[PDB]
Design a protein around this motif. Structure first.
Motif, PDB file in Angstrom:
ATOM      1  N   UNK B  62      27.072  74.343 -22.426  1.00  0.00           N
ATOM      2  CA  UNK B  62      25.772  73.686 -22.342  1.00  0.00           C
ATOM      3  C   UNK B  62      25.483  72.929 -23.635  1.00  0.00           C
ATOM      4  N   UNK B  63      25.473  71.599 -23.555  1.00  0.00           N
ATOM      5  CA  UNK B  63      25.137  70.755 -24.705  1.00  0.00           C
ATOM      6  C   UNK B  63      24.072  69.716 -24.349  1.00  0.00           C
ATOM      7  N   UNK B  64      22.888  69.874 -24.931  1.00  0.00           N
ATOM      8  CA  UNK B  64      21.858  68.843 -24.877  1.00  0.00           C
ATOM      9  C   UNK B  64      21.983  68.011 -26.146  1.00  0.00           C
ATOM     10  N   UNK B  65      22.373  66.747 -25.983  1.00  0.00           N
ATOM     11  CA  UNK B  65      22.653  65.862 -27.118  1.00  0.00           C
ATOM     12  C   UNK B  65      21.435  65.570 -28.007  1.00  0.00           C
ATOM     13  N   UNK B  66      20.231  65.808 -27.488  1.00  0.00           N
ATOM     14  CA  UNK B  66      18.992  65.664 -28.271  1.00  0.00           C
ATOM     15  C   UNK B  66      18.900  66.672 -29.417  1.00  0.00           C
ATOM     16  N   UNK B  67      19.633  67.776 -29.295  1.00  0.00           N
ATOM     17  CA  UNK B  67      19.617  68.838 -30.292  1.00  0.00           C
ATOM     18  C   UNK B  67      20.863  68.790 -31.161  1.00  0.00           C
ATOM     19  N   UNK B  68      20.657  68.657 -32.470  1.00  0.00           N
ATOM     20  CA  UNK B  68      21.747  68.710 -33.441  1.00  0.00           C
ATOM     21  C   UNK B  68      22.475  70.054 -33.348  1.00  0.00           C
ATOM     22  N   UNK B  69      21.699  71.137 -33.302  1.00  0.00           N
ATOM     23  CA  UNK B  69      22.235  72.495 -33.238  1.00  0.00           C
ATOM     24  C   UNK B  69      23.154  72.710 -32.025  1.00  0.00           C
ATOM     25  N   UNK B  70      22.720  72.257 -30.845  1.00  0.00           N
ATOM     26  CA  UNK B  70      23.494  72.414 -29.603  1.00  0.00           C
ATOM     27  C   UNK B  70      24.844  71.686 -29.606  1.00  0.00           C
ATOM     28  N   UNK B  72      26.644  70.725 -32.486  1.00  0.00           N
ATOM     29  CA  UNK B  72      27.472  71.351 -33.520  1.00  0.00           C
ATOM     30  C   UNK B  72      27.995  72.703 -33.037  1.00  0.00           C
ATOM     31  N   UNK B  73      27.101  73.534 -32.512  1.00  0.00           N
ATOM     32  CA  UNK B  73      27.490  74.835 -31.988  1.00  0.00           C
ATOM     33  C   UNK B  73      28.403  74.713 -30.767  1.00  0.00           C
ATOM     34  N   UNK B  74      28.120  73.724 -29.921  1.00  0.00           N
ATOM     35  CA  UNK B  74      28.914  73.457 -28.723  1.00  0.00           C
ATOM     36  C   UNK B  74      30.382  73.194 -29.004  1.00  0.00           C
ATOM     37  N   UNK B  75      30.653  72.290 -29.942  1.00  0.00           N
ATOM     38  CA  UNK B  75      32.031  71.923 -30.280  1.00  0.00           C
ATOM     39  C   UNK B  75      32.763  72.972 -31.116  1.00  0.00           C
ATOM     40  N   UNK B  76      32.003  73.788 -31.838  1.00  0.00           N
ATOM     41  CA  UNK B  76      32.571  74.930 -32.545  1.00  0.00           C
ATOM     42  C   UNK B  76      33.092  75.967 -31.548  1.00  0.00           C
ATOM     43  N   UNK B  77      32.361  76.160 -30.451  1.00  0.00           N
ATOM     44  CA  UNK B  77      32.798  77.040 -29.363  1.00  0.00           C
ATOM     45  C   UNK B  77      34.013  76.488 -28.608  1.00  0.00           C
ATOM     46  N   UNK B  78      33.994  75.189 -28.307  1.00  0.00           N
ATOM     47  CA  UNK B  78      35.146  74.515 -27.706  1.00  0.00           C
ATOM     48  C   UNK B  78      36.382  74.723 -28.584  1.00  0.00           C
ATOM     49  N   UNK B 123      26.699  59.600 -29.242  1.00  0.00           N
ATOM     50  CA  UNK B 123      28.112  59.323 -29.477  1.00  0.00           C
ATOM     51  C   UNK B 123      28.487  59.593 -30.926  1.00  0.00           C
ATOM     52  N   UNK B 124      27.592  59.225 -31.844  1.00  0.00           N
ATOM     53  CA  UNK B 124      27.798  59.424 -33.283  1.00  0.00           C
ATOM     54  C   UNK B 124      27.985  60.908 -33.662  1.00  0.00           C
ATOM     55  N   UNK B 125      27.071  61.793 -33.241  1.00  0.00           N
ATOM     56  CA  UNK B 125      27.192  63.234 -33.575  1.00  0.00           C
ATOM     57  C   UNK B 125      28.366  63.891 -32.864  1.00  0.00           C
ATOM     58  N   UNK B 126      28.584  63.523 -31.604  1.00  0.00           N
ATOM     59  CA  UNK B 126      29.739  64.020 -30.864  1.00  0.00           C
ATOM     60  C   UNK B 126      31.028  63.658 -31.604  1.00  0.00           C
TER      61      UNK B 126
END
Ligand SMILES: NC(=O)c1ccc[n+]([C@@H]2O[C@H](COP(=O)([O-])OP(=O)(O)OC[C@H]3O[C@@H](n4cnc5c(N)ncnc54)[C@H](OP(=O)(O)O)[C@@H]3O)[C@@H](O)[C@H]2O)c1
Ligand SMILES: NC(=O)c1ccc[n+]([C@@H]2O[C@H](COP(=O)([O-])OP(=O)(O)OC[C@H]3O[C@@H](n4cnc5c(N)ncnc54)[C@H](OP(=O)(O)O)[C@@H]3O)[C@@H](O)[C@H]2O)c1
Ligand SMILES: COc1ccc(Cn2cnc3cc4c(cc32)CCCC4)cc1C
Ligand SMILES: COc1ccc(Cn2cnc3cc4c(cc32)CCCC4)cc1C
Lengths: 255, 254
Positions: B62-70, B72-78, B123-126
């Motif tokens: 679950x990644x909502x791109x509006x949230x920096x935390x989601x 960063x945490x999302x891709x760390x889990x991936x 796209x930038x944060x991703x």
């Protein structure tokens, strides 16, 4: 993904460093039946040696000078009756007199202007016309262009105008041949040390700039163009026509 | 090839999503696929949709791109679950429908910034986070629309967000190039998706493409997937900062 039972005509191999040879190596590894055209007898000698290919009948070598309607019409008629109908054409042909690139653009003679137009741009139109006759189910036509057709590049001069013409030629062919299910696209290759780079002074300087300024920080080679050519000549690029793809390490995208 | 490749696919809502066309193709090519979703309803769809060959995979985050935390945490889990990654397909856009109905000069600040936030900055944060999982390089691809290059009726604030995204692609390309990471955009022609089903008179423009475009037909999701397959693989080796139109040649006319 196909190519196994498919047939492609490659136009414009002169030696081992020709962009078109890069295309040939890639399509050969994918298992395509290849047909080659050449102008100079010297290019015929090179073609025969360069058949370091996986192609079974190392024939399919035709003499075609695109300045003659006769030769392109007869040439493609001969391809059809010898090989059957085709799936695509790779166009890798350009010419200008060297004096016109040294070389003040405003001094370009009419004959020098028309020669470049004739061989570098119109050749696609007539080749497409003849190629269509051998593509009853449809197909894909790809032309090689350069950044000089979009922006004024130092010394490129008359070839830049010929490339701009060729790119528009691609778009007008795409609109016309679309209903026949024939897609027409271009590859805008970055600078590569080829037979045509001979005579062009300060060629190392421009390769140096690519290495130092382009996003990828490296120059491209013939086989990279070949891999995009494979993408364009196949059904992987099914919804794509009238397009110009830059295989140039992203140099088109910067200042 | 692609048997030993792993791609992150962002932005699948249902069977008609452009990004499901991408997954469809990559899965046929033997790739391992990681999916991200925002809505719980989209996660349920993902589980049904996995009529793929990704065996006990269901790599869902679950990644909502509006949230920096989601993000960063999302891709760390991936990164934790799959190790390294080879690419990201970005297929996320949003704008309030009021801004499309809808005079462009009347666009509110919140609307403008929200469309930029989700459709472009995402796209930038991703890219920044996905880069952490691409030690030897990779490929990032974003979906755009011709509305980013030209003023298209009713596209309005989304056109500005697509123009922002196209430049985003170019600036990331220059930035990430030296890290051996390519970034490109696919400009898709109009496709009947959940998002497009929200725009009035969508049938009219599909009829227009069919009559005007060189190929005299519309494109589908798997056609965008095939070009994505090209852009995500080493077949597009020297191609970066590019925008490839999968739109039956409509970009090239009048
Ligand atoms: N080299 C680069 O840096 C670069 C960059 C971007 C684009 N391109 C483009 O890539 C294409 C291939 O060129 P290249 O770099 O690979 O050099 P090349 O090997 O010299 O290719 C040029 C080819 O065009 C053929 N040709 C010229 N006039 C002809 C005519 N009247 N009839 C038939 N064929 C003719 C030549 O054949 P003969 O020698 O037998 O006459 C030769 O095989 C060109 O269109 C060029 O504009 C090159
Ligand atoms: N359909 C067309 O005609 C067309 C043409 C050209 C380009 N495009 C572009 O292609 C892309 C794919 O859209 P689509 O047409 O396939 O529509 P879609 O199926 O509705 O996809 C949109 C996706 O964006 C996600 N999303 C929206 N806001 C988000 C947020 N804040 N955080 C995370 N995810 C969010 C949605 O996820 P949830 O459902 O989980 O919220 C949804 O999966 C879009 O960028 C669109 O601009 C579409
Ligand atoms: C610095 O500008 C340049 C950058 C790349 C090139 C290489 N090049 C690209 N298309 C070409 C066509 C021709 C020649 C050289 C060509 C030679 C004669 C036949 C047609 C040339 C210049 C001038
Ligand atoms: C010719 O006009 C159009 C052509 C295609 C479309 C479809 N479309 C493309 N990108 C989109 C992004 C969004 C929506 C619809 C979108 C709606 C939800 C928010 C994100 C819309 C118009 C207006």
């Amino acid at each position: 993904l196909n190519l196994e039972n498919k047939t492609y005509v490659i136009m414009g191999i002169a030696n081992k460093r020709s962009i078109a040879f890069g295309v040939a190596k890639v399509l050969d590894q994918l298992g395509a039946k290849l047909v080659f055209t050449y102008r100079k007898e010297r290019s015929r000698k090179e073609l025969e040696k360069l058949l370091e290919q996986l192609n079974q009948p190392e024939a399919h070598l035709y003499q075609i000078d695109v300045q003659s309607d006769e030769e392109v019409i007869n040439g493609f008629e001969q391809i059809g009756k010898d090989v059957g109908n085709i799936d695509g054409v790779y166009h890798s042909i350009a010419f200008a007199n060297m004096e016109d690139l040294r070389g003040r653009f405003s001094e370009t003679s009419r004959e020098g202007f028309l020669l470049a137009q004739d061989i570098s741009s119109y050749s696609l139109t007539i080749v497409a016309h003849e190629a269509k006759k051998l593509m009853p189910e449809g197909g894909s036509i790809v032309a090689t262009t350069y950044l000089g057709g979009e922006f004024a590049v130092q010394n490129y001069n008359v070839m830049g105008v010929a490339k701009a013409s060729l790119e528009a030629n691609v778009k007008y062919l795409a609109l016309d041949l679309g209903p026949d299910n024939i897609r027409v696209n271009a590859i805008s290759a970055g600078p590569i040390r080829t037979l045509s780079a001979k005579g062009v002074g300060g060629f190392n300087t421009i390769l140096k700039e690519i290495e130092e300024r382009a996003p990828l920080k490296r120059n491209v080679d013939q086989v990279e163009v070949g891999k995009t050519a494979a993408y364009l000549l196949s059904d992987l690029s099914s919804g794509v026509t009238g397009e110009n793809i830059h295989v140039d390490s992203g140099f088109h995208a910067i200042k």
